[PDB]
Amino acid sequence: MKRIFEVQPWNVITHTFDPKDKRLQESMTSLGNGYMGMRGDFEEGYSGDSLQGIYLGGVWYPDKTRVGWWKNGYPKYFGKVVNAVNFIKLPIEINGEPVDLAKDKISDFTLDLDMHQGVLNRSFVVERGAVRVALNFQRFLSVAQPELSVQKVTVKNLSDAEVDVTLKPSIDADVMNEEANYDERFWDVLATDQQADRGSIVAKTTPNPFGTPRFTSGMEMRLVTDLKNVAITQPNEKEVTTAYTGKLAPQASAELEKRVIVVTSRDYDTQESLTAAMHQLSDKVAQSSYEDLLNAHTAIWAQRWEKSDVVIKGDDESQQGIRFNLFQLFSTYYGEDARLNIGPKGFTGEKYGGATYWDTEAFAFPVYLGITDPKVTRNLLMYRYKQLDGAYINAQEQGLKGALFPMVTFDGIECHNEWEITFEEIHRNGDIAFAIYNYTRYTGDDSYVLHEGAKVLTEISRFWADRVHFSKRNNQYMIHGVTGADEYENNVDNNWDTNMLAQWTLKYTLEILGKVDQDTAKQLDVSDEEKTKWQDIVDRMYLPYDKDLNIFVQHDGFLDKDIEPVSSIPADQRPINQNWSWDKILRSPYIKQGDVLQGIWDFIDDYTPEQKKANFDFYEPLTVHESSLSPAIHSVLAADLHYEDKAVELYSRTARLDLDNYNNDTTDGLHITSMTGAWIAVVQGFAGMRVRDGQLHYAPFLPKTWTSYTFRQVFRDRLIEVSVHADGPHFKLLSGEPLTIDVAGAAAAAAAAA
Amino acid sequence: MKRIFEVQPWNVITHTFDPKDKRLQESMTSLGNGYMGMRGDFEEGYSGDSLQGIYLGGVWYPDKTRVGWWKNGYPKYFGKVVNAVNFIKLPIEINGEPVDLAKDKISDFTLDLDMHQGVLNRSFVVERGAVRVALNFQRFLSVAQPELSVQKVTVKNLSDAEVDVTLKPSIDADVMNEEANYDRFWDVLATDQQADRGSIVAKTTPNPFGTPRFTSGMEMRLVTDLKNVAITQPNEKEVTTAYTGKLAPQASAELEKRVIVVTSRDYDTQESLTAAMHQLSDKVAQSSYEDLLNAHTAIWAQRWEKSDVVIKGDDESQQGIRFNLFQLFSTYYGEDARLNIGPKGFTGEKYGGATYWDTEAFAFPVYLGITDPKVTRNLLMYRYKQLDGAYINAQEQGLKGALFPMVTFDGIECHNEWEITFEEIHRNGDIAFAIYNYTRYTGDDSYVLHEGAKVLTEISRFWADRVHFSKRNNQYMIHGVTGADEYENNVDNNWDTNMLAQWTLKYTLEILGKVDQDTAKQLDVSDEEKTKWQDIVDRMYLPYDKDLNIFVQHDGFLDKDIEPVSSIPADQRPINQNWSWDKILRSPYIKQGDVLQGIWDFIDDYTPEQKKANFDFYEPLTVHESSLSPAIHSVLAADLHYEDKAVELYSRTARLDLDNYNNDTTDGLHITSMTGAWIAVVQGFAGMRVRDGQLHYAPFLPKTWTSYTFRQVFRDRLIEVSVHADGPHFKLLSGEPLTIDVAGAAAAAAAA
Numbered sequence A: 001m002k003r004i005f006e007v008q009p010w011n012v013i014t015h016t017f018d019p020k021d022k023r024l025q026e027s028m029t030s031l032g033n034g035y036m037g038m039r040g041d042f043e044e045g046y047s048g049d050s051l052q053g054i055y056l057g058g059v060w061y062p063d064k065t066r067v068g069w070w071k072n073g074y075p076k077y078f079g080k081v082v083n084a085v086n087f088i089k090l091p092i093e094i095n096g097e098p099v100d101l102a103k104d105k106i107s108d109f110t111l112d113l114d115m116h117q118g119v120l121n122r123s124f125v126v127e128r129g130a131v132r133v134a135l136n137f138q139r140f141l142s143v144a145q146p147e148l149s150v151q152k153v154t155v156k157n158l159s160d161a162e163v164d165v166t167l168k169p170s171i172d173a174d175v176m177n178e179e180a181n182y183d184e185r186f187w188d189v190l191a192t193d194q195q196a197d198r199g200s201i202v203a204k205t206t207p208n209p210f211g212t213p214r215f216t217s218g219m220e221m222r223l224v225t226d227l228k229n230v231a232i233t234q235p236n237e238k239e240v241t242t243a244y245t246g247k248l249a250p251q252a253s254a255e256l257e258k259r260v261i262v263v264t265s266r267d268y269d270t271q272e273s274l275t276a277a278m279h280q281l282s283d284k285v286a287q288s289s290y291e292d293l294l295n296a297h298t299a300i301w302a303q304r305w306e307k308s309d310v311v312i313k314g315d316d317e318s319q320q321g322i323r324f325n326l327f328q329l330f331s332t333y334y335g336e337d338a339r340l341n342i343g344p345k346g347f348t349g350e351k352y353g354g355a356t357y358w359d360t361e362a363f364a365f366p367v368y369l370g371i372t373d374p375k376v377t378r379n380l381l382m383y384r385y386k387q388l389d390g391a392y393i394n395a396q397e398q399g400l401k402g403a404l405f406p407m408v409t410f411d412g413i414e415c416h417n418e419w420e421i422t423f424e425e426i427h428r429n430g431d432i433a434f435a436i437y438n439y440t441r442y443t444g445d446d447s448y449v450l451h452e453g454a455k456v457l458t459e460i461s462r463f464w465a466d467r468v469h470f471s472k473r474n475n476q477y478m479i480h481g482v483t484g485a486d487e488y489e490n491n492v493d494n495n496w497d498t499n500m501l502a503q504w505t506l507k508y509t510l511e512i513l514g515k516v517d518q519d520t521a522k523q524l525d526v527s528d529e530e531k532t533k534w535q536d537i538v539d540r541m542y543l544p545y546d547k548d549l550n551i552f553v554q555h556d557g558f559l560d561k562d563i564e565p566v567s568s569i570p571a572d573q574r575p576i577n578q579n580w581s582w583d584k585i586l587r588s589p590y591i592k593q594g595d596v597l598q599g600i601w602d603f604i605d606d607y608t609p610e611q612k613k614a615n616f617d618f619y620e621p622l623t624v625h626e627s628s629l630s631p632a633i634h635s636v637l638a639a640d641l642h643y644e645d646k647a648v649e650l651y652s653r654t655a656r657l658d659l660d661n662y663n664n665d666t667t668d669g670l671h672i673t674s675m676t677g678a679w680i681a682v683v684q685g686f687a688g689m690r691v692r693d694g695q696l697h698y699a700p701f702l703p704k705t706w707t708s709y710t711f712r713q714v715f716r717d718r719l720i721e722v723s724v725h726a727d728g729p730h731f732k733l734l735s736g737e738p739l740t741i742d743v744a745g746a747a748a749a750a751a752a753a754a
Numbered sequence B: 001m002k003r004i005f006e007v008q009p010w011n012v013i014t015h016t017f018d019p020k021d022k023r024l025q026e027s028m029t030s031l032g033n034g035y036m037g038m039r040g041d042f043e044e045g046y047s048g049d050s051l052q053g054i055y056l057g058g059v060w061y062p063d064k065t066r067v068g069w070w071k072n073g074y075p076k077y078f079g080k081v082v083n084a085v086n087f088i089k090l091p092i093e094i095n096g097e098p099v100d101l102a103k104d105k106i107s108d109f110t111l112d113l114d115m116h117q118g119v120l121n122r123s124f125v126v127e128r129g130a131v132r133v134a135l136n137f138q139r140f141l142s143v144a145q146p147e148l149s150v151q152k153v154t155v156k157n158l159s160d161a162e163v164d165v166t167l168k169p170s171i172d173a174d175v176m177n178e179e180a181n182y183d184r185f186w187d188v189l190a191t192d193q194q195a196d197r198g199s200i201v202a203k204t205t206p207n208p209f210g211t212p213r214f215t216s217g218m219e220m221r222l223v224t225d226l227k228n229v230a231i232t233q234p235n236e237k238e239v240t241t242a243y244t245g246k247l248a249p250q251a252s253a254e255l256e257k258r259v260i261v262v263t264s265r266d267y268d269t270q271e272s273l274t275a276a277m278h279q280l281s282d283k284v285a286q287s288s289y290e291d292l293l294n295a296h297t298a299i300w301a302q303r304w305e306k307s308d309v310v311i312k313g314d315d316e317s318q319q320g321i322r323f324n325l326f327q328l329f330s331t332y333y334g335e336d337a338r339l340n341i342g343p344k345g346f347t348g349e350k351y352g353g354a355t356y357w358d359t360e361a362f363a364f365p366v367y368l369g370i371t372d373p374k375v376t377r378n379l380l381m382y383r384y385k386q387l388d389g390a391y392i393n394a395q396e397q398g399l400k401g402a403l404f405p406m407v408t409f410d411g412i413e414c415h416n417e418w419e420i421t422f423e424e425i426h427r428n429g430d431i432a433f434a435i436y437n438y439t440r441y442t443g444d445d446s447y448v449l450h451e452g453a454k455v456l457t458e459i460s461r462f463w464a465d466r467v468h469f470s471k472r473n474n475q476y477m478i479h480g481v482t483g484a485d486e487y488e489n490n491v492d493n494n495w496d497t498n499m500l501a502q503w504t505l506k507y508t509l510e511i512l513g514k515v516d517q518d519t520a521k522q523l524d525v526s527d528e529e530k531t532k533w534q535d536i537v538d539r540m541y542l543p544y545d546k547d548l549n550i551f552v553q554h555d556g557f558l559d560k561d562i563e564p565v566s567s568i569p570a571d572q573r574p575i576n577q578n579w580s581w582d583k584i585l586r587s588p589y590i591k592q593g594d595v596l597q598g599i600w601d602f603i604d605d606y607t608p609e610q611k612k613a614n615f616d617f618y619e620p621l622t623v624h625e626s627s628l629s630p631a632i633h634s635v636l637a638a639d640l641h642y643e644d645k646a647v648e649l650y651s652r653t654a655r656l657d658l659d660n661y662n663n664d665t666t667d668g669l670h671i672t673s674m675t676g677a678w679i680a681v682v683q684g685f686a687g688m689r690v691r692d693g694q695l696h697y698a699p700f701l702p703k704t705w706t707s708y709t710f711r712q713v714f715r716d717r718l719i720e721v722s723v724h725a726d727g728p729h730f731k732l733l734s735g736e737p738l739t740i741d742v743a744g745a746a747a748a749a750a751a752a
Ligand SMILES: [K+]
Pocket: A488, A489, A585, A586, A587, A588, A589, A590, A591
């Protein structure tokens, strides 16, 4: 829809500043180190339209549920990551007047996100008539020191006369979540400390009646500068500040570094110990130079790129896309904290609350299995196991047995508040179970599924067994009143994907129960009566199908709709979520994202080329891709069917979803969980990567518009590099023991230095 | 739950006062004259738990729509009822201490709602040891002078030794709304206080939605034997008068308080509103209590002459039916075509002031049978006059024609649930049906051939644009809807909905060929449209199952796990209060008539065999979690000769409020719910119906009833139907000779 940044291989940079595209711009320039993250907000302040957003991983608030009308079973709160105390604040005054790009005239603007070093640069000249001052910013959230945020500002007087410049590094707790249900603050300041060269604020989320955890943050600022310190009084009980000034001669420069340490109660047991660590880490960092801190940061990012960069030659728009995805994906989550997960919009916005969704096991798993240690995904599996208690509660809220994993959660308990989604989008249980299988197949490690995983599969199967009903009229089991992955169909009957996933879950669990050891089988305690019941459900599950079209019907009665292609929809009416009333969206034949195709994608090798063709040709043209998680899987499926041009088109739609604002909603933040798309399209799609009966298989094709593409993949303790050129694919074993892979049907042995 | 009033024929009276039942008492003793109304609040004041509620017809206030997640098309705001300036306030001090039933001890208590005269009586003895004082209250909201409220208080000293009494009639604008916290809704524009009278002109505060602000003018005049005393104005928001006197043992005194209430709904300007306030107050000051009361009771007596239902052998039912009609008439009597029937009338505020499809579906049949046709005619013009809002509602969903709202005050939608707001479109058909129902009953073509033709045309245009053609089935269908049975959401081809759409288009086409040249030109319906409409009627898909010989509520309904309601644990009923919404939706349980609602609307267009198959299949799946579901099914049962079943279903309609069935009558009465009993009795028990211009009956007598007699207005005739064990009897009380059909036999009525 709109591309506000230039195209470059390693940078997302622009020389244009427009107040009208501020939120979009802030989203694109977000940063993160897994421990915390934030939007590309201007630290000196900005009075125009903007979304202030800084988020601490795992730090959320239980916002009391807000709905028009209540329904029995609805959750009591919507957990959402808290917009944190503003610790980057650093107003800049020129001759006493603060800089504010919403009002100031500027020249020579540059906003540059350096993806290779993981740093955000921004520079411009403040144009105030005869008074002209250049400002150069650079900052980063250290991947070397998780609690560390580093900012640097360089000032240069371009005027013909002396000018006064004053920087006021500070910490401001007067913040709020724009999406708060009742327009109320979530932070209470516990302690503030202001000195000549330091400042710190210890805050704690306000109390709640839901018995959920309250979080304490400790933020301390330390400085490095050649400016003169000035006395300043603490402005409020919710803000601490310092002041440094300098009378710059023409062409003279000054600079200041702001080092902020951020600690939270999830890593320290008491306010006292938390406060102590805050001070100790600050003392430690004050011993390091800017270069020291930066190099340690860049060295780690360089290492990450070394292991997982995707080099595309001949198409920079595509190069920039894949690198932006992986950059923001890893900035959000790199498996460093086993307690965390991946919020849909990571640390770049508020929508969805940064909570845990089915996005993780459906779309994130494929990528983390491919480029990170298998222990990362194994832990994402345990994350759910550890929340089984909450799943039992969710199911009970709907009068169902077994485990019902939530649509939205932080502790296992449901958070979403829409009956069509909260109670009915149950396919998620199936996606959760599939992730277990996917991890097991990929890694060859069945120690999880034969233990903790068996319990999760058992309880999910228990849910399915209680949720289906037997239709005497059809002598088959059915699943009425649901919402499939395609959220543009609500409260429908026999959503194919859901029935398929339920049947598969039961089938797989029965397989696993036959493999666990006696002690485990005893604990699971699944009677022969249960197994017989489950087997009957597997045997007689109803699956809608249409002979004439040879397709699986999304849900019963789908073909009764007024079927017409997406091409018939006027461009000015798209996206339909922003232009049509909900009833119109629901009854129309338009699909939000993969549903039948999501199922086929999960079980891509279980369907024949003809079946896949029939379903793809029918559904793809009806899909509006209004979920960022839609384009990528469609690209893979297209590649699978040899629709090379369509695959590349879809690749661009996912790889550059945010960069080109495809869904006209990047103003709300980046589609982080969707950042998995480009990699999937390139590897599973273009390269045709599949894991079959324990061995890696590829069958690559090269986008006609490309010279080549190279990527690295982690597979059972081996690190492989795949390079695709016009003359065919090329493989190199970078590490690990000799491995035999399948390439278009030919077995090739890989060995180091050979 | 608990019955707090005695069972009497024409009175809802009790001699017991328990502060615990205060709110319940207040709701039950509400009064109203179609222009204004109020709960049975104690005018002298009460410091205990209570709901202050005085409401002016047509007055409302807007508030921002509130939902969890927004959907394009949702209304921007919703309307609310507003507690008006307190004009009945009249504290009574005995020896300088005001009476307060929340503190004072009393004896010989009486709370009496006289339904025949439309008057509220209350009396008791204030017990304060050596001091004992009797207090007798009487008040009414005149149906002779709509702007008039009349109160009377009689004080009688019963103790030994003289006693001091002081009454302070006043008007207090410092009122609040309970359902809110949003402090004040009224700004005082002008106050006046004299030793002889008082008045307050107030106006609702400004809103950001561009909706109307309302100004009220209230003036009080007195008539008493007590001596006037000079008293200073309490404050900026209240004006008062004071009268005192010393009563010797057994001596008494009285005081009347006449209040005139006018609103900006009837006056172009503030000073014209103020002028009227004074003019009417002068006029009323020329009349005695007896004359004001007599004029009032005379009109109520006339209302009963045309609608009374006398039941012998079931006193509980006798009181219930009378109470239903009384509160209905008190809420609305077709005096102002701009007003309607809110779920709570003038008895409370929680979701009680808007207009629902309920008046067209259930209130209409009742008013048609017991009031002059002019009343229901006004109920029709009400929708015609809000056509503009209907266009907006349709446009909010990208649809053509008119889409009448689910909930409204000004014609624009107020509801905030996509499955109801956007999808429960059967309401459009119900509104079109009301036009037909009225025409068939009255025989008056004037409305349908004019204003009605426009309403039908635009509703037809909505249908023509809302349906879609399914090439696969070569039939038109209507996907993604919610029928009357709200326990099925976003379903496809709800039979009742498709049936109503087809009917609407078919009826409109008939009407178009009959309107005059001016109307035709105004409607401007091309031949292209007419051809299209006919095609829709001709090829409309209607779900049907041959083996069960039933109309299928919606596509796929039979794939549900069909099981009788008897299988639901008794303690889990009502299910909307026990189950999660998803379970309710996928279950085969029905909230209220859906397919049966349509059969009820066209009860003579389906064969006994079709009606039996459909009733027999659906009634056992219906949980009747709607106030009117039992009444509608009672009629269908009676229609099928299921006498016991019809009676059983009827037993829950009449006393919903009197016996507080839902444990929420404390919030107010269920006015729109009070139409069920009459329907079940006359259409059901008596088998009343209009067929091709002729009136018909085929009554049976409930086993426990000795007899029942009801009045009915038809084609300018006043008929009295008396059903006894020896059969039915008829009396033509007024009007020209009329031939009716009684169980197939033609009977000529005369001696009118
Ligand atoms: K749809």
